[PDB]
Amino acid sequence: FKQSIHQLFETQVERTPEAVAVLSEQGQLTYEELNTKANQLAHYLRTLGVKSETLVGVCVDRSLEMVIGLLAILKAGGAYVPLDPTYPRERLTYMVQDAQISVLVTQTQWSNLISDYQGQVICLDSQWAKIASYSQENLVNTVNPENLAYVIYTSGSTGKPKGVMIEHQSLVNFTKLAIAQYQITTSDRTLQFVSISFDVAAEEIYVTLCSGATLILRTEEMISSIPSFVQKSQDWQITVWSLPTAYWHLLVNELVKSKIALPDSLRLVIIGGERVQPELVRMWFKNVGNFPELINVYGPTEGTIAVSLCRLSQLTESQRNRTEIPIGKSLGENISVYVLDETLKTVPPETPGEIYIGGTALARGYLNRPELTAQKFIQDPFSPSERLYKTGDLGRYLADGNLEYLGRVDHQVKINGFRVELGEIETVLLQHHQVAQAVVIDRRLVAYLVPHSTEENLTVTLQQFLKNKLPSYMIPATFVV
Ligand SMILES: Nc1ncnc2c1ncn2[C@@H]1O[C@H](COP(=O)(O)OP(=O)(O)NP(=O)(O)O)[C@@H](O)[C@H]1O
Ligand SMILES: NC(=[NH2+])NCCC[C@H](N)C(=O)O
Ligand SMILES: [Mg+2]
């Protein structure tokens, strides 16, 4: 039963061609229309040399175009590499060079964003008349399941981000499991929330589109305030929210502080990305109750989005009166979530250890980082045909079988909900001429540094320096000497 993610999508299109697939504040596309437009772009991409294992950069804003673009790259047999337009030129250029990207799917408003680029560029906004001349038919046979679907960059502690290579087979497995876990149906309306620079965007997009639900693309404005976010979700009649945990934390505090009613259409809230606060979980159950359903979802990018989940609304009082809220149990049978000792042996229940992931969830590895790949994706000594991914997350299984997240072994953290290696920022700061040694810590980022010379506006100088290298959320608010 061999299948690619776009094939899963294609099966759905055939089932329900006239359903609305994607909605934005600007327009909408039916399943048929999304499929035919992605086919037209895909056919064009094939004529540009895009084929299986070809990496295609995607530098688009959240729009109907974004979705067409992702699906087209997939259908052409390529793997997309998200290139976040809010990142600085130098970071984007690095990714393009590192990934050897020679096709860039973008829009005219982003065209000056690569330190400039010798490959083929397609601007979806200005060249649609050309693209509309290509075939609307599904392409046949362009990938195997072991072929890449996307390469997504994450923070690197040695000083540069690195790409996590995700094959179709792991993504398809994820998507099918999540669809059944969440009970997504053709009646659902899912809010597309996170940037495609984070793999949770793939959950939101593919779970929705491969089940026949409607994907609703959010605006920048709707998240600036919780009342706006809630009211717009009520206007859209949203049934599924997928929220970074830190944003859900904001939401809960504002719910109680105000008398804001949740949308009446909302049936499920999926959270993840960092440790949920038991107090806010208790505050949620007191003020909201058990509907909408609340699920805590865990996993790293390297395990294809998520590997564990816990239905918080199904926890007993006692399970929620604990000091950690569980991250739960494996998303499915072909995914193993282990707590292991230093020799990779399982431990008795309630014994803490490090979380390692096995089975269908695994990334192929890190793009062009053989040392890091060998370090993190380990051959299973007790099952040599298989690999384990070392998560760097500590945890323990409770007697009831639920996994608890216990923290990190290292200096990876989450800032604004985004994965940050403190070593990335620290490594980058050492490159400045007037920094001698440097250390960056949470908690919020504060930089600890001894300069070569003390200049008295060194805050703004190191800030402006990092501004052009690192995403904003990697820039400390304050510095210390
Ligand atoms: N439900 C959860 N509870 C606690 N921690 C979580 C949960 N979900 C994810 N995490 C943490 O987030 C890590 C995985 O981050 P990941 O999803 O790989 O990065 P990201 O947020 O997409 N940003 P990046 O990968 O740098 O672009 C895990 O290893 C945990 O430390
Ligand atoms: N809504 C979700 N399914 N979120 C997934 C949570 C796990 C994911 N690794 C993260 O860091 O966010
Ligand atoms: Mg993830």
Cα 393 to ligand 1 centroid, rounded to whole Å: 9
- How far away, in angstroms, is 462 Cα from ligand 3 center? 30
Residues counted in the chain: 481
Q: Tell me which residue of 375, 98, 37 sits closest to 356, measured CA to CA.
A: 375
Ligand 2 centroid from CA 301, angstroms: 9
| Tokens linked to 463 | 């800030």
- Which residue's CA lies nearest to atom 4 of ligand 2? 272
CB 397 within 8 A of CB 336: no
Rounded distance, CA 167 to CA 411, Å? 28
With a CB cutoff of 8 Å and minimum separation 6, the contacts of 117 are 93, 96, 104
Ligand 2 atom at minimal distance to the Cα of residue 303: 9
* Annotated binding residue 419: yes
Test site for ligand 1: of 150, 298, 413, most ligand atoms within 8 A of the Cβ: 298
Residue 189 β-bridge partners = 214
Q: In which residue ranges of the chain is CATH 3.40.50.12780 found?
A: 1-409
Element (H, E) at 229: helix 226-236
Q: Which residues are paired to 353 by β-bridges?
A: 395
Q: Are 419 and 155 in contact (CB under 8 A)?
A: yes
**How many A from CA of 274 to the centre of ligand 1?**
6
Question: From edge to edge, which strands make up the β-sheet containing 268-272?
Answer: 28-30, 20-23, 214-217, 189-192, 240-244, 268-272, 293-298, 308-311, 329-330
Query: Which residues are registered as beta bridge partners of 438?
Result: 449
> Which CA distances in Å does 125 have to 29, 81, 238, 307?
16, 19, 28, 37
Which residues, judged by CB distance below 6 Å to any ligand atom, belong to the binding site of ligand 2?
200, 203, 242, 270, 272-273, 297-300, 306
Closest ligand by atom to 277 CA: 1
Method: X-ray
Topology adopted by domain 410-481: GMP Synthetase; Chain A, domain 3 (3.30.300)
CATH H-level superfamily of 1-409: ANL, N-terminal domain (3.40.50.12780)
How far is residue 323's CA from residue 308's CA, in Å, rounded to a whole number? 19
- Take atom 10 of ligand 2 and give the residue whose Cα is closest: 273
User: Distance between CA atoms of 236 and 454, rounded to whole angstroms?
Assistant: 54
- Residue 405 near ligand 1, beta carbon < 6 Å: yes
Two structure tokens written together for 212:
């026949």
Every domain range in the chain assigned CATH 3.30.300.30: 410-481
Instruction: Please confirm whether the linkage preceding 443 is cis (ω < 30° from 0).
Output: yes
Residue 311, SS3 per DSSP: strand
- Does 380 count as an annotated binding residue? no
For the CA of 414, the closest atom of ligand 2 is 11
Cβ neighbourhood burial of 296 (10 Å; 0-12, 13-18, 19+): buried
> Which amino acid does the sequence have at 294?
L
Structure tokens at 322: 């604990």
